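Help! Submission page says 'invalid entity' but I think these are all valid:
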Amino acid sequence: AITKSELNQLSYLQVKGTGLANRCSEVIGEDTITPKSGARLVDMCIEPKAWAVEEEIGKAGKTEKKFVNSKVMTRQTYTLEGIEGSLKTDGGKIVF
Amino acid sequence: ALPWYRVHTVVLNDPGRLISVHLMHTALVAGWAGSMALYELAVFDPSDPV
Ligand code: CLA
Ligand code: CLA
Ligand SMILES: CCCCCCCCCCCCCCCC(=O)OC[C@H](CO[C@H]1O[C@H](CS(=O)(=O)O)[C@@H](O)[C@H](O)[C@H]1O)OC(=O)CCCCCCCCCCCCCCC
Ligand SMILES: CCCCCCCCCCCCCCCC(=O)OC[C@H](COP(=O)(O)OC[C@@H](O)CO)OC(=O)CCCCCCCCCCCCCCC
Ligand SMILES: CC1=C(/C=C/C(C)=C/C=C/C(C)=C/C=C/C=C(C)/C=C/C=C(C)/C=C/C2=C(C)CCCC2(C)C)C(C)(C)CCC1
């Protein structure tokens, strides 16, 4: 539904058509992890929620480069899924 | 019998057709307003209002 654990409790038949397949999951907590050695980020999901395009606009006797809002012309087909990478620590910082 | 500059005097004593002809001028005016607005909207550039 909202978290992965209870998303895995649903059928393909009772999810098809609703639009939940294009949504990203939600976490719950405030702990710390610290990746071990030789770890990999897996299942990463990225979901956009607002789009803007840079162009010229006019406020009052002036023009400036501003980001104007835009509406998506396609449908719920814009979220990335399944991204994987390899974590490592260079000098106390994590690299993806 | 009427000359060309007196043709539209046949409705002088006909209250029923005076309404009709005045309605016709009204319809023509309204149509002109609508069509002029439509034509103007197709050649207007709203990018720079300054
Ligand atoms: C008490 C009711 C009443 C009302 C509401 C009106 C209203 C009007 N009269 Mg009038 N009139 C009245 C009594 C009334 N009159 C009486 C007692 C007489 C003597 C018989 C006349 C004789 C008279 C003449 C000779 C003329 C008018 C015209 C007009 C119209 C001029 C403005 C116009 O065209 O707007 C533009 C119109 C609109 C924006 C549309 C408004 C919506 C309409 C009214 C809906 C129509 C539905 C309704 C069932 C039609 C019948 C009602 C009718 C009485 C208005 C205007 C709507 C003129 C006209 O018709 O020109 C076209 C005209 O030449 N009147
Ligand atoms: C307050 C606004 C107003 C008024 C008072 C009028 C008044 C009139 N309109 Mg109208 N009209 C208006 C707004 C108005 N209009 C608007 C906003 C539109 C939309 C663009 C029209 C479109 C329209 C059409 C399409 C027609 C009228 C016509 C008429 C006339 C019908 C009465 C008649 O028989 O006159 C008798 C006619 C005259 C007295 C001649 C008047 C001449 C005018 C004032 C100047 C001439 C124009 C220009 C100089 C061209 C001359 C060159 C020519 C010799 C080749 C009348 C004078 C009808 C008309 O004139 O046909 C006869 C007609 O067919 N009107
Ligand atoms: C029902 C409507 C009632 C009225 C409502 C309000 C009016 C509606 C719009 C009317 C526009 C007509 C004039 C256009 C402006 C113009 O002349 O200059 C613009 C261009 C300049 O020319 C050329 O020059 C230009 C530069 S170039 O060619 O590219 O070099 C180019 O841009 C252009 O395309 C090219 O044509 O003129 C023309 O070439 C257009 C030719 C006319 C267009 C068709 C007219 C339709 C009329 C038919 C009905 C007649 C009715 C008679 C009585 C019943
Ligand atoms: C969709 C719209 C398309 C149409 C739009 C409008 C069309 C309207 C056109 C009508 C105009 C026609 C008027 C002619 C009709 C015509 O003239 O008829 C002459 C006409 C005759 O009057 P009578 O009462 O004798 O009419 C007898 C009748 O049979 C006429 O119907 O007299 C007048 O109209 C008086 C005005 C004097 C007019 C003088 C005209 C001469 C002017 C100068 C000529 C140029 C000189 C050049 C050298 C310098
Ligand atoms: C029927 C119907 C309909 C339709 C309608 C329509 C389609 C309309 C149109 C209308 C129109 C579209 C109109 C138009 C008009 C126009 C006009 C009316 C014009 C006029 C002009 C003039 C008059 C001019 C003149 C001149 C010249 C030419 C030159 C210079 C000078 C002068 C300006 C004077 C509908 C569906 C809705 C509904 C149902 C019924």
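Support: the input was valid. A stray whitespace character was the problem, and the output above is from the cleaned input. Chain B touches chain A at residues 47-50 (CB under 8 Å).
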